[PDB]
């Protein structure tokens, strides 16, 4: 799969990090890491994904 993944990071900007603070139910500071090859955000219904 990584053979196709060579396009990512080379040609185009790719998302790698998001930082929140007191946004919704996320009291205090937070952060999430996004892998250049693709990320999947999971959790129970109604927790903060959206």
């Amino acid at each position: 799969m990584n053979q196709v993944s060579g396009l990512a990071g080379k040609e185009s900007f790719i998302l790698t990090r998001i930082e929140l603070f007191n946004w919704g139910g996320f009291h205090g500071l937070h952060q999430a890491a996004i892998h250049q090859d693709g990320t999947a955000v999971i959790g129970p219904t109604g927790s903060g994904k959206t």
């Binding site: 129970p44 219904t45 109604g46 959206t50």
Partner: protein, 148 residues
């Protein structure tokens, strides 16, 4: 509506779903609709309220069992987590209705716990069919003289 709110009994009162605390009894959510909500949460709100209204409609006054008992749920739990669909099924059971779920092979492990038959449907070319399946539990004993 001006005359409806004078001559029609149905328009003399305004409804609103509410969430009660089991212990204290204090209301937390005077939900008048589903604006907002996460989705899935929206789904459980809709399913609870609609099953309640269906039981009202199908039941003659003073009857605990509706003479028609079946309900259909297409794309059931299509956006609800296992924990939410479980309580949806629990509410359906409490109202006493027999639920026909439809799903595109999703949440299979959940239906496994709360159904006793399945109808597989498959397409090839310009044609399609179905086939029947069932299962049950051998409750007599998990293992004689063992831990159960």
């Amino acid at each position: 509506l001006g005359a409806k709110a004078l001559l029609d009994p149905r328009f003399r009162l305004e409804f609103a779903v509410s969430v009660m605390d089991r212990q204290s009894g204090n209301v937390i959510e005077s939900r008048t609709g589903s604006q907002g909500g996460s989705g899935g949460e929206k789904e459980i709100i809709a399913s609870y309220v609609l099953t309640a209204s269906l039981s009202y409609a199908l039941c003659p006054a003073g009857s605990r069992y509706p003479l028609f008992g079946t309900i259909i749920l297409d794309e059931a739990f299509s956006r609800s987590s296992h924990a939410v669909a479980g309580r949806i099924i629990a509410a359906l059971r409490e109202f006493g209705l027999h639920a026909v779920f439809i799903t595109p092979n999703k949440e299979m492990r959940l239906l496994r716990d709360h159904t006793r038959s399945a109808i597989v449907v498959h397409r090839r070319g310009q044609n399609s069919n179905m086939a029947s399946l069932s299962w049950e539990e051998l409750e007599r004993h998990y293992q004689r003289r063992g831990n159960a």
